[PDB]
Write a protein that binds this DNA or RNA. Structure first.
Ligand SMILES: [Mg+2]
Ligand SMILES: [Mg+2]
Ligand SMILES: [Mg+2]
Ligand SMILES: [Mg+2]
Ligand SMILES: [Mg+2]
Ligand SMILES: [Mg+2]
Ligand SMILES: [Mg+2]
Ligand SMILES: [Mg+2]
Ligand SMILES: [Mg+2]
Ligand SMILES: [Mg+2]
Ligand SMILES: [Mg+2]
Ligand SMILES: [Mg+2]
Ligand SMILES: [Mg+2]
Ligand SMILES: [Mg+2]
Ligand SMILES: [Mg+2]
Ligand SMILES: [Mg+2]
Ligand SMILES: [Mg+2]
Ligand SMILES: [Mg+2]
Ligand SMILES: [Mg+2]
Ligand SMILES: [Mg+2]
Ligand SMILES: [Mg+2]
Ligand SMILES: [Mg+2]
Ligand SMILES: [Mg+2]
Ligand SMILES: [Mg+2]
Ligand SMILES: [Mg+2]
Ligand SMILES: [Mg+2]
Ligand SMILES: [Mg+2]
Ligand SMILES: [Mg+2]
Ligand SMILES: [Mg+2]
Ligand SMILES: [Mg+2]
Ligand SMILES: [Mg+2]
Ligand SMILES: [Mg+2]
Ligand SMILES: [Mg+2]
Ligand SMILES: [Mg+2]
Ligand SMILES: [Mg+2]
Ligand SMILES: [Mg+2]
Ligand SMILES: [Mg+2]
Ligand SMILES: [Mg+2]
Ligand SMILES: [Mg+2]
Ligand SMILES: [Mg+2]
Ligand SMILES: [Mg+2]
Ligand SMILES: [Mg+2]
Ligand SMILES: [Mg+2]
Ligand SMILES: [Mg+2]
Ligand SMILES: [Mg+2]
Ligand SMILES: [Mg+2]
Ligand SMILES: [Mg+2]
Ligand SMILES: [Mg+2]
Ligand SMILES: [Mg+2]
Ligand SMILES: [Mg+2]
Ligand SMILES: [Mg+2]
Ligand SMILES: [Mg+2]
Ligand SMILES: [Mg+2]
Ligand SMILES: [Mg+2]
Ligand SMILES: [Mg+2]
Ligand SMILES: [Mg+2]
Lengths: 63, 116, 203, 144
RNA sequence: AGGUUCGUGGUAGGAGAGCGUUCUAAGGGCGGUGAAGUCAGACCGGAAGGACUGGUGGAGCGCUUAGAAGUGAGAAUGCCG
RNA sequence: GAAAGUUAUAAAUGAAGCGGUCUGGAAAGGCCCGCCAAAGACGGUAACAGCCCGGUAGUUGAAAUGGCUUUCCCUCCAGAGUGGAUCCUGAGUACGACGGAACACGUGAAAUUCCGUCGGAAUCCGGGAGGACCAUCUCCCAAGGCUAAAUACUCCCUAGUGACCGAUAGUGAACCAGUACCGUGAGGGAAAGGUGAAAAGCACCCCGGAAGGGGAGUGAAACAGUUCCUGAAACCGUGUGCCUACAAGUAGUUAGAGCCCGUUAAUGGGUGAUAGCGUGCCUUUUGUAGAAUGAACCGGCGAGUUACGAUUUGUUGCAAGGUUAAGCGGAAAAAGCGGAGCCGUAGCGAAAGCGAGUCUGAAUAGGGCGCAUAAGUAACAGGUCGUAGACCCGAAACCAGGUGAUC
């Protein structure tokens, strides 16, 4: 059978033009009194998946 | 297709068993102990090709020592004197000469003695 | 090339298309296509039984502990005498096919290669009134063939398939069925003029 | 057929493990010693991390998918120079020539490249720069 | 193809080059004036291995270039004799 | 209910060498000559046969019964138009509440279908759907029924095929096999092929109660003699060249006399008084001669595979392009046809959208991702991964249907 896409990953990753993955920051739900405005300004942007993680998760989001 | 294992196993094992001719009992009959015995023989031969040279040098040195003591010398003094005189005859030739042609040995001993 | 007649006498000359019979053959392509066509022929009817398809089993031969024997779980395990086979053969297909352009290049290459070695004979016609293998053998003797041959004919050739059927190095094909494996399998190629025209216009 | 030789480097011989120690893949067959990964059928899932929370569970989900989403077949200006000047480029002509076979939701002309010919171009959409570039060479644009 | 220099202990492990077994295709061969198998020899190659000669045997089997694998056992308190 | 045709279930005919010679037990083999072929398929025959036999291609044949196809017979038959008073168009039904189930859809913003229980319509100025629902529009007419082909499978019969097995293999079963045997029963479940071309299967004599031998005879062979082709190793014996009864031995190896031989002929073979050195193999370990594990010995069998996807490397074809799938065609071929689809040629954004840029932002700011700074695609081969038992062997247990109170 053809292999299945990890549905949970496809809901929160994004493929860029050079073939690598773009993600969102993960400290951004509910405790905003306990972190400063600099932190919150920088946590609302996007990031990229590191090389060590990409080696591990490459094949489960292949399409 | 199917490959059945015929005629190669027997050939290999028979070669090993024949390499163990002359060993005691099962060691020249049965493959499993013959294989071990053949490996052990190969290892022993490898090591003894090194030990043979040093054993022969020991024998030559002892014979030269005995020959030189009859000329009022030691092996150590005789070898040092032969070095001082520029003589480059090795232990093998000196021991052969001692056993077989003692007159030339005495000649060389006189040469060494004068060198000292 | 020089045309010649069914009795062997010269009949003039014929020009063959340079795009089909005059290219530089691609030997690697021809080898790939031959191996593909030959793998496509095999049938693949072979199977074994694994430990679940052998009759019996199910019951444990003896207890796990206490008896002093090795632990066993079935009498049809792979290390038992009449037990199952571990992987073995299974029914499958071997046929594969590589792209169309490479196949056209392969047929052109093998056919030009036949031309270069002077192993191609162009023939004005080929007919026989009634099926007669003696007469076809005589015809094969008139032209110096004496070896394996592939005859390629078009319509209006009568009783050529029947008269050549009992001879064993000879194969007659109807000019739309020419293939790399069949050409490489015979030493000489004998072609009629109508068939070579049709071969040129196909490719 | 008795002298077949495939192109070199195109075929390699398979490797077989568990066939004696002179090959380097003998007893343990390249697996090491005594783990989960040494067993038959062993190993963990694709993204498993041994019990630490996996990376995808740490970051949020974003967005939604639009059901009325439109995507266009894209034409730049360089390929449009293969036409004789004075003609009328139409979607059907672009289909026939071979620039486009898939008309997703229309044809959009973009402005990457240069045109040196006067043409009248009919399409579903134009970018502003493409329209200016086409009109600067003496052509005309119409929205279908 | 020839030089110069530096190297050549090794477990887990990575890389390379090969030996041998069964079958298929083509070429080219052997064989009742004796095939395969089996037995014995003081022969050849760097290894896996390969010949030659004689006995037994009494009908099939190598070689070359390719291709495909039920592909090589000394150990599993392994299974059967 | 008839007739014609065809087909199935027995069959008939059917070309060409007793060719010479060699070896041999025997010629189909070797050498030298011929011939047939719409027939050089297969099998047999004293060794390997197109021309010896049964046959093969081609051409014929059916009393009887079955099937199929046509024709006759037989049987049964109203279909157009124009109108719009009145009438009809599936009721405890459709739907709704509650509890469940099926829908890829786990109650969810949940349309659609079904079941149990309660309530419960309209009827042409009517009713349903378009993923809650309302309005507009569009499409349709439930609560009655029947319907061939394209699709699934093989206990069988006929004709064949295989880079499928070859007696521990292939079916459990090539042999009087679901048998012998085990069990109260349900149930479990073997081992076991080969004389020779032809029985020509050893008249007769001798030892012995016989069995079994030694001759004689048959045969190419009896060292093929009714478990009979070949006939390995373990294991058991008889004979003999060299050594051995003052010696402490993982059994060899290196040095080495003496004695005895004579080879694939080469700085050769067997045995060895005496001298030096020397704690098996495997597994598992920081570390094993280990007083840790496994193996009595010999033989056979016994473990990384296949299918479909992903990625990377190599090779080949074409190249801003590359490539067909199912299907048609055919010989279980090879072409040709088939462009539906798929990947690439443009990105950025959650999205509307804009586009060599875009998003954020009040911003002609800065920053993120892209372009400048362009090569892909189809097929095969190697490595690794995913879904499958997934390198092989091994639990204690769990569930479902049966069999047992002859203890
Ligand atoms: Mg011996
Ligand atoms: Mg000895
Ligand atoms: Mg030394
Ligand atoms: Mg099977
Ligand atoms: Mg089990
Ligand atoms: Mg059995
Ligand atoms: Mg396989
Ligand atoms: Mg192509
Ligand atoms: Mg290969
Ligand atoms: Mg290799
Ligand atoms: Mg190699
Ligand atoms: Mg071998
Ligand atoms: Mg042959
Ligand atoms: Mg042998
Ligand atoms: Mg032998
Ligand atoms: Mg031998
Ligand atoms: Mg004989
Ligand atoms: Mg392969
Ligand atoms: Mg195999
Ligand atoms: Mg096998
Ligand atoms: Mg081993
Ligand atoms: Mg075991
Ligand atoms: Mg055992
Ligand atoms: Mg037995
Ligand atoms: Mg046993
Ligand atoms: Mg005759
Ligand atoms: Mg004779
Ligand atoms: Mg003859
Ligand atoms: Mg025939
Ligand atoms: Mg025959
Ligand atoms: Mg004949
Ligand atoms: Mg009513
Ligand atoms: Mg609704
Ligand atoms: Mg509802
Ligand atoms: Mg719809
Ligand atoms: Mg509708
Ligand atoms: Mg129905
Ligand atoms: Mg097969
Ligand atoms: Mg046998
Ligand atoms: Mg018989
Ligand atoms: Mg017989
Ligand atoms: Mg008596
Ligand atoms: Mg008697
Ligand atoms: Mg015999
Ligand atoms: Mg015999
Ligand atoms: Mg014997
Ligand atoms: Mg024996
Ligand atoms: Mg003796
Ligand atoms: Mg004493
Ligand atoms: Mg001696
Ligand atoms: Mg003595
Ligand atoms: Mg321990
Ligand atoms: Mg043993
Ligand atoms: Mg295997
Ligand atoms: Mg590799
Ligand atoms: Mg009971």
């Amino acid at each position: 059978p053809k292999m299945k896409t990890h549905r949970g990953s496809a809901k929160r990753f994004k493929r860029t033009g050079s073939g690598k993955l773009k993600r969102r920051h993960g400290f951004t739900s509910h405790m905003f009194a306990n972190k400063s405005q600099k932190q919150k300004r920088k946590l609302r942007k996007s990031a990229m998946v590191s090389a060590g993680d990409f080696k591990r998760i490459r094949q489960m989001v292949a399409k | 297709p199917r490959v059945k294992g015929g005629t190669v196993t027997r050939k290999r094992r028979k070669k090993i068993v024949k390499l163990a001719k002359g060993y005691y009992g099962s060691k020249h009959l049965l493959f499993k102990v013959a294989n071990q015995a053949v490996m052990k023989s190969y290892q022993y031969a490898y090591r003894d090709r090194r030990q043979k040279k040093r054993d022969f040098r020991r024998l030559w040195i002892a014979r030269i020592n005995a020959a030189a003591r009859m000329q009022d010398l030691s092996y150590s003094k005789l070898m040092h004197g032969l070095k001082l005189a520029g003589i480059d005859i090795n232990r093998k030739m000196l021991a052969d000469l001692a056993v077989n042609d003692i007159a030339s040995f005495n000649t060389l001993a006189d040469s060494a003695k004068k060198a000292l | 090339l020089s045309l010649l007649k069914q009795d062997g006498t010269n009949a003039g000359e014929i020009t063959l298309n340079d795009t089909v019979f005059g290219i530089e053959p691609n030997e690697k392509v021809v080898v790939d296509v031959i191996l593909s066509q030959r793998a496509s022929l095999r049938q693949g009817t072979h199977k074994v039984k694994n430990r679940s398809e052998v009759r019996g089993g199910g019951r444990k031969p003896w207890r796990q502990k206490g008896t002093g024997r090795a632990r066993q779980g079935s009498i049809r395990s792979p290390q038992w005498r009449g037990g199952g086979v571990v992987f073995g053969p299974t029914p499958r297909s071997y046929a594969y096919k590589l792209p169309k352009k490479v196949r056209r290049l392969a047929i052109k290459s093998i056919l030009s290669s036949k031309v270069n070695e002077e192993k191609l004979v162009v023939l004005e016609g080929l007919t026989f009134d009634a099926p007669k293998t003696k007469e076809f053998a005589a015809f094969l003797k008139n032209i110096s063939v004496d070896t394996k041959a592939l005859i390629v004919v078009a319509g209006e050739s009568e009783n050529v398939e029947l008269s050549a059927r009992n001879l064993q190095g000879i194969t007659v094909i109807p000019a739309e069925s020419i293939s790399v494996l069949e050409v490489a399998k015979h030493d000489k190629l004998i072609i009629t003029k109508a068939a070579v025209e049709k071969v040129e216009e196909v490719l | 057929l008795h002298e077949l030789k495939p192109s070199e480097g195109s075929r390699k011989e398979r490797n077989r493990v568990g066939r004696g120690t002179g090959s380097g893949n003998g007893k343990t067959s390249g697996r090491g010693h005594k783990g989960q990964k040494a067993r038959s059928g062993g190993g963990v899932r694709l993204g498993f991390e041994g019990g630490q929370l996996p990376l995808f569970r740490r970051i949020p989900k974003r967005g939604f998918t639009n059901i009325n989403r439109k995507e266009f077949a894209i034409v730049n200006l360089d390929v449009l120079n293969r036409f004789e000047d004075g003609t009328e480029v139409t979607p059907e002509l672009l289909i026939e020539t071979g620039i486009i076979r898939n008309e997703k939701s229309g044809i959009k002309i973009l402005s990457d490249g240069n045109i040196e010919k006067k043409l009248t171009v009919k399409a579903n959409k134009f970018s502003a720069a493409a329209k200016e570039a086409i009109e600067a060479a003496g052509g005309k644009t119409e929205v279908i």
